[PDB]
Amino acid sequence: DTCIIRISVEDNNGNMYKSIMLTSQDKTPAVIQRAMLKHNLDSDPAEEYELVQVISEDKELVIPDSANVFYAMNSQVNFDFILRKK
Amino acid sequence: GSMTEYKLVVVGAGGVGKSALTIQLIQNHFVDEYDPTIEDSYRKQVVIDGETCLLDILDTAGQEEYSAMRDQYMRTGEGFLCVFAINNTKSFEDIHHYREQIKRVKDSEDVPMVLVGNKSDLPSRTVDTKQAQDLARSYGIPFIETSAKTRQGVDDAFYTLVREIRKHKEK
Ligand SMILES: Nc1nc2c(ncn2[C@@H]2O[C@H](COP(=O)(O)OP(=O)(O)OP(O)(O)=S)[C@@H](O)[C@H]2O)c(=O)[nH]1
Ligand SMILES: [Mg+2]
């Protein structure tokens, strides 16, 4: 089973987001790696980055580094995530 | 009110250069890589005929696996860049289906659109310019040949689409 998630980065590069596929079997490391490739991020190792779901105006959900993302994400809100350096 | 924003959508078959054209416009950058798109979103502030405006650009999937997403983005989009590659005849014939779906979703015979023949830097074209010019004339829309690599026509294609939107919104 699968779904589409949107990944943004903080760099002022004119990109609002890029979408990637998420599966029920993915854990966070593989998602961060897929996100980094999509955004051409290769000078750092994946462990410097965290994946963060946008829940609302003033709440975010840091996805834990060794979680299943389907289980850890909030399935009740839009699937928008930020990829950023810890 | 504030600065006008234009919702632009780039459509066409997989591999014709939708993402490369957008990345060249936004970032002045080109890299030869294989990175199939699901759905990406960009923004850029530009000046067209003296008016500063914001381009909100949606870069879509050419792979038919993602065909079900079309209805949503066609309802939201105000103008469409219909992209084929000049060395890929099937991508040129695929333009028809994109145009027909846009017209159906928007329930209108004149939606702002521009026909874009990309990869004009390459030799061994298979779609001749006249053929594409003649199709665009039958559709009643502008035609522009582009290269995401050399920047030939890139700004013009997006600026021309904004001009087409502005003509439509008055009419
Ligand atoms: N020579 C040349 N190569 C181009 C040009 N535009 C794109 N390419 C190359 O063609 C290939 C496909 O481009 P890409 O931008 O990914 O297509 P796309 O239309 O976005 O493909 P998709 O997301 O629907 S699967 C890439 O290798 C890219 O570097 C161009 O104008 N000239
Ligand atoms: Mg693409």
Swiss-Prot record, chain A:
Interacts with Ras. It comes from Homo sapiens. This is Ral guanine nucleotide dissociation stimulator-like 1. Residues 1-86 form the Ras-associating domain. Probable guanine nucleotide exchange factor. The chain holds residues 648 to 733 of 768 of the full protein. Expressed in a wide variety of tissues with strong expression being seen in the heart, brain, kidney, spleen and testis. Disulfide bonds: none annotated.
From Swiss-Prot, chain B:
The modification N-acetylmethionine is found at M3. Acetylation at Lys-106 prevents interaction with guanine nucleotide exchange factors (GEFs). Lysine-depalmitoylation by SIRT2 promotes its localization to endomembranes in endocytic pathways. Alternates between an inactive form bound to GDP and an active form bound to GTP. Activated by a guanine nucleotide-exchange factor (GEF) and inactivated by a GTPase-activating protein (GAP). Interaction with SOS1 promotes exchange of bound GDP to GTP. Transmembrane segments: none annotated. Its EC number is 3.6.5.2. Changing P36L: In NS3; characterized by a defective GTPase-activating protein sensitivity and a strongly reduced interaction with effectors. Changing K119N: In colorectal cancer samples; somatic mutation. The modification N6-acetyllysine is found at K106. A motif (Effector region) lies at residues 34-42. The modification N-acetylthreonine is found at T4. Changing G15R: In pylocytic astrocytoma; somatic mutation; increase activation of the Ras pathway. GO terms for molecular function: G protein activity; GDP binding; GMP binding; GTP binding; GTPase activity; identical protein binding; LRR domain binding; protein-containing complex binding. One of its GO terms (cellular component) is cytoplasm. Glycans are attached at T37. It is an enzyme of class 3 (hydrolase). Keywords: Acetylation, Cardiomyopathy, Cell membrane, Cytoplasm, Deafness, Disease variant, Ectodermal dysplasia, Glycoprotein, GTP-binding, Hydrolase, Intellectual disability, Isopeptide bond, Lipoprotein, Membrane, Methylation, Nucleotide-binding, Palmitate, Prenylation, Proto-oncogene, Ubl conjugation. It is found in: Cell membrane; Endomembrane system; Cytoplasm, Cytosol. Its main location: membrane. The keyword Cell membrane applies. GO terms for biological process: actin cytoskeleton organization; cardiac muscle cell proliferation; cytokine-mediated signaling pathway; epithelial tube branching involved in lung morphogenesis; female pregnancy; forebrain astrocyte development; gene expression; glial cell proliferation. It is a lipid-anchor. Ras proteins bind GDP/GTP and possess intrinsic GTPase activity. Plays an important role in the regulation of cell proliferation. Plays a role in promoting oncogenic events by inducing transcriptional silencing of tumor suppressor genes (TSGs) in colorectal cancer (CRC) cells in a ZNF304-dependent manner. It is linked to Leukemia, acute myelogenous: A subtype of acute leukemia, a cancer of the white blood cells. AML is a malignant disease of bone marrow characterized by maturational arrest of hematopoietic precursors at an early stage of development. Clonal expansion of myeloid blasts occurs in bone marrow, blood, and other tissue. Myelogenous leukemias develop from changes in cells that normally produce neutrophils, basophils, eosinophils and monocytes. This is GTPase KRas. It comes from Homo sapiens (Human). The gene is KRAS.
